[PDB]
Write an enzyme that holds these catalytic residues in place. Structure first.
Site, mmCIF file in Angstrom:
data_model
loop_
_atom_site.group_PDB
_atom_site.id
_atom_site.type_symbol
_atom_site.label_atom_id
_atom_site.label_comp_id
_atom_site.label_asym_id
_atom_site.label_seq_id
_atom_site.Cartn_x
_atom_site.Cartn_y
_atom_site.Cartn_z
ATOM 1 N N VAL A 282 -5.040 14.422 0.868
ATOM 2 C CA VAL A 282 -3.641 14.781 0.829
ATOM 3 C C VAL A 282 -2.776 13.544 0.543
ATOM 4 C CG1 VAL A 282 -1.743 15.523 2.235
ATOM 5 C CG2 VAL A 282 -3.976 16.684 2.422
ATOM 6 N N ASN A 283 -1.796 13.663 -0.346
ATOM 7 C CA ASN A 283 -0.959 12.495 -0.647
ATOM 8 C C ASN A 283 0.351 12.907 -1.303
ATOM 9 O OD1 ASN A 283 -0.930 9.416 -0.775
ATOM 10 N ND2 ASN A 283 -0.460 9.901 -2.924
ATOM 11 N N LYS B 254 0.855 -1.192 0.000
ATOM 12 C CA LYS B 254 0.000 0.000 0.000
ATOM 13 C C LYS B 254 0.888 1.238 0.000
ATOM 14 C CE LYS B 254 -3.983 1.945 2.307
ATOM 15 N NZ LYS B 254 -4.971 1.739 3.422
ATOM 16 N N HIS C 122 4.360 3.654 6.239
ATOM 17 C CA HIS C 122 3.574 4.902 6.340
ATOM 18 C C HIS C 122 4.512 6.080 6.030
ATOM 19 C CE1 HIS C 122 0.010 3.029 8.029
ATOM 20 N NE2 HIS C 122 0.690 2.550 9.061
ATOM 21 N N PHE C 123 3.963 7.112 5.397
ATOM 22 C CA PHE C 123 4.680 8.323 5.037
ATOM 23 C C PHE C 123 4.210 9.306 6.094
ATOM 24 C CE2 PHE C 123 7.085 10.614 1.856
ATOM 25 C CZ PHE C 123 6.777 11.966 2.138
ATOM 26 N N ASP C 124 5.090 9.648 7.022
ATOM 27 C CA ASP C 124 4.735 10.548 8.116
ATOM 28 C C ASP C 124 4.685 12.031 7.708
ATOM 29 O OD1 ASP C 124 4.012 9.588 10.747
ATOM 30 O OD2 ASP C 124 5.554 10.916 11.568
ATOM 31 N N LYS D 144 -9.022 11.042 -1.814
ATOM 32 C CA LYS D 144 -8.047 11.070 -0.699
ATOM 33 C C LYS D 144 -7.648 12.570 -0.679
ATOM 34 C CE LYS D 144 -4.184 8.519 1.183
ATOM 35 N NZ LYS D 144 -2.966 9.287 1.459
ATOM 36 N N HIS E 86 2.600 6.043 -2.526
ATOM 37 C CA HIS E 86 3.729 6.964 -2.467
ATOM 38 C C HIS E 86 4.938 6.847 -3.366
ATOM 39 C CE1 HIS E 86 1.562 8.346 1.052
ATOM 40 N NE2 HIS E 86 1.707 7.181 1.655
#
Ligand SMILES: [Cl-]
Ligand SMILES: [Cl-]
Length: 124
Positions: free
Chosen positions: A43-44, A7, A119-121, A41, A12
């Protein structure tokens, strides 16, 4: 079900370009990566570096995650990235996004074996 690692890759990674080519980059990518299926979505971020360079961040600078957890890592170098954010005109099913390109340090949360980004912090 999609694994956490896959994912993170889908949401990302964009190693096919050196940076956002145009203002329509985000509209196109948010749709093609399936981030506007049942909802837009909001924000990405897409990182424009090789998958190997992004995974290597999990062995770089250990920093705290905004949630207080201790499995976040900040890239030692700046990386080309594009931030996508819904514009006020967005509503769904006609999502609209502003494309903002830059070069920043990325912060990711890592887990598993292999120890990879899940995860992209944030940037920085
Ligand atoms: Cl897959
Ligand atoms: Cl993001």
């Amino acid at each position: 079900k999609e694994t956490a690692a896959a994912k993170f890759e889908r949401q990302h990674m964009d190693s096919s370009t050196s940076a956002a080519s145009s203002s329509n980059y985000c509209n196109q990518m948010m749709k093609s990566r399936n981030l506007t299926k049942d909802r837009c979505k909001p924000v990405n971020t897409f990182v424009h570096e090789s998958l190997a360079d992004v995974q290597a961040v999990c062995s770089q600078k250990n920093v705290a995650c905004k949630n207080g957890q201790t499995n976040c890592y900040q890239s030692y170098s700046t990386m080309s990235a594009t931030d996508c954010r819904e514009t006020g005109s967005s509503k769904y099913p006609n999502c609209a996004y502003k494309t903002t390109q830059a070069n920043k340090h990325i912060i990711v949360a890592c887990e598993g074996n292999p120890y990879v980004p899940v995860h992209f912090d944030a940037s920085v």
